[PDB]
Symmetry: D2
Subunit: 251 residues, 4 copies
Amino acid sequence: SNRLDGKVAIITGGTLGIGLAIATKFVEEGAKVMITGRHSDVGEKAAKSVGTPDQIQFFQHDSSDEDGWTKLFDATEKAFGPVSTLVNNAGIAVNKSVEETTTAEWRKLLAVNLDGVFFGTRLGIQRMKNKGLGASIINMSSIEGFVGDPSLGAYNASKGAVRIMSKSAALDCALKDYDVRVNTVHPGYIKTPLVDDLPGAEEAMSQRTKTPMGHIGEPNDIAYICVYLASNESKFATGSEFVVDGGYTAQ
Amino acid sequence: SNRLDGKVAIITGGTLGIGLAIATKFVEEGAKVMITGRHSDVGEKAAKSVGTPDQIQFFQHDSSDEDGWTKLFDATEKAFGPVSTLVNNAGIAVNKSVEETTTAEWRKLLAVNLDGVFFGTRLGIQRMKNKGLGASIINMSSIEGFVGDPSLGAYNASKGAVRIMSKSAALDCALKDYDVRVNTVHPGYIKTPLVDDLPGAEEAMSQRTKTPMGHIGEPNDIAYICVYLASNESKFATGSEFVVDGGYTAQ
Amino acid sequence: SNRLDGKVAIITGGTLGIGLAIATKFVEEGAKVMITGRHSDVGEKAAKSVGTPDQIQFFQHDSSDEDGWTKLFDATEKAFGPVSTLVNNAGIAVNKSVEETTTAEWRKLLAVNLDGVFFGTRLGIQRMKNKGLGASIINMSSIEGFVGDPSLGAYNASKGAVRIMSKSAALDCALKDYDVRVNTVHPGYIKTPLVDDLPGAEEAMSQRTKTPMGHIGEPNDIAYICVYLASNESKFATGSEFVVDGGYTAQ
Amino acid sequence: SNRLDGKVAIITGGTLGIGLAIATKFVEEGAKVMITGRHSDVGEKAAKSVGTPDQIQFFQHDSSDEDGWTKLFDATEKAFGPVSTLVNNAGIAVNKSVEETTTAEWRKLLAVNLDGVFFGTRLGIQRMKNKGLGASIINMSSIEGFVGDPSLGAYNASKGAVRIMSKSAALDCALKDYDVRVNTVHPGYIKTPLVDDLPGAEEAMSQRTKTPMGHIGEPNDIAYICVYLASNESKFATGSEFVVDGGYTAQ
Ligand SMILES: [Mg+2]
Ligand SMILES: [Mg+2]
């Protein structure tokens, strides 16, 4: 309770799934939140479901849209004051091996999962540093930032990039005393409506050879590690990877 | 607040420093705690400083003492009910390169830092599994479980061992549905009275080439990640390494 | 001696530095080699400096040029027969933090260091699979695929991406029994004429806080690990990272 | 051919399997070799199977025997001159989870797999430093130094320890300009006569969920990486881990 007192957070892809759970717990611990998403119909319903406009608002945005990032920050500042916390959560996947990935698929995925994370991280550092906010940038990877999957080629590329880029940003921010931390979170498989929509997906992910726990996680498993990283409890963590994966990467 | 509702924790080396901060925050979040340490004079004062006997007690023990482990568990059960949570925190260091380590130094260090962790982990699994406790075993490494230090040879050995042994235990516990998670925590340098006692130590550890933040951490930086791992918030994390190091290992 | 009997290799950025040493040793070990580079004057002179056209040729190419990759594979086949070995070595750097990277610098570095490696890996799998060649794709990272550097933000993103994408491609090729291995090489600092042109650069890179050996490496340190990976000596190695760094990443 | 000109190597557990293939290739590449093993009958026959006494000899030793290590180095010097290269290959396994490991099994496995490697590394540094030998210490781990296995608890502890202790020793040797490199080798599953004696073992280890290549390796896959590490070809490699696993750890 009140673990995020006074924080102001942007969560990209905050209207569904993992993003939405992050938002929900952020609001519960006292943060002001701006969630983003591509569809206003979903976005505005999501925001209202979590709380009132003085707690949480929606902002329509594609994380691959560089200019929209500037608008997003300005809007969040107008609503809630200076942003302290950024969760780069929006992502997409392509279910293809490297061999079978088209160039269009490659660029589309990178623009969200890599360029978007870059735009958010770069803008977040510039806007959040040197303000005594206890600022924190939480970049969503994946277990796919640690291990390959033969049918997630471009996704693996994007998540390996976010992993190491985040260390670079962490170190610069530390060395320059910016009061900004940057860390990555690496979910294993997580049960969401989208997973429920793909027959047999949870069942495959729940095989012991994939997830040793023999079941997949839930959105709140990611929201709780994000609360920790956004909070000043984690003021000495920067440049680190936080895995919450049911044992996936342990074997 | 009440993040450790109903938990019963053993924290080895709980009377000083990082251990003591863990204990303090554990009690604050509603856990019952048994702290261990080598000296009763220090131990009993430490326990009373944190709370009353129905919250926290001391138990004298050297973590390298296999038979004492059994007593420790029995005592903790007698005081507080079934143990749910084990923090293997007790450790020592030897300030020697591998080349310059005597065999006596080697065995002494291993007996605490490796055998002790093994005895605790093995006994913890046996006593905690299959009880619906939400059991959690948190094994203290180190940044020295990731990277070498030329003057910490045996220490590096012990911390690399704990790191991977912990994954083995994690996986067995998961695959057998024991309801026990095992994870490791990897502090960077942390300011304690013992560090304050070694002239120039904090100053050396605070050089940017060591810790990018340009200062070292404090005991509560470790206590907070331990609260998370002991709590059911982290029910999908097992077999993972959690680093809190000021950027040390990021560069 | 004759460690690469019968192999046919493409080495991108093969006209200078690391690439040129790889090419030199490849030819010494009996491979046929196509080197690429941006300047025809340089490339032709480099090929002739190594051997005759029956051993080594040049093909002008920018590794970001998708169509030109098809032309390079066609050309190499026409000269030497079916390609067995690809070294994705071309790369560029931007000396900027994430915070200070322009979008143009981001895209230009990614086009070479990431898209180019994708284009080469994808086409290499297509062309080399299922031909009993003992095919091997060697993707040049860097130490910057393991650790961050505060002033190499885009470069870190690109080297992280190559690291994990290469595991994805390894796994698919193994699972499909393609007779293609994929592995990464991670040089630390290496002395080249370009380093020699920057006063003080080698000395800085040779500080013990950077390279524990107290000096930097030479192009042949990367050529020898590449001969191992290209040869059938490494037939059981796939999806692995091979680091040759003077200790940089060990501390 | 002549890749180990002038070298003098000790290989522990050199009479069978991986060790014997290392010894065979070492001799083929011009090294002088002392192999160790427990059974004199086996050892003498193995040495003679590889070459003559001017190329290779046997010394009976249990790698847990501290004093015998001094005797082994003395003996090797007397036969061949100053030792340049040490391969710490001897090891044993216990097929138990952490939970089910007796203390006796723990101590017996650690004495060989951990203390023995310490004793060899320590004495090797002492003996090989500062002699212009291009000295190289190659510590055999395993994939079990990266990932856990639920039924190899003590083995995982020992392989984690060797992994990181070896980085400590690398760093000290580099920093002190000792002309000693230390690196680890991490085999995945390898076909030997001992595997062949367990019905079904190879088939199980060859499942794609274990080894993506769908088959296991052979002793020469580990011998070739060891020739690279022992040779001056790898003069800039220290403190690194070299994995040869058929993809095991990539997924
Ligand atoms: Mg795995
Ligand atoms: Mg480092």
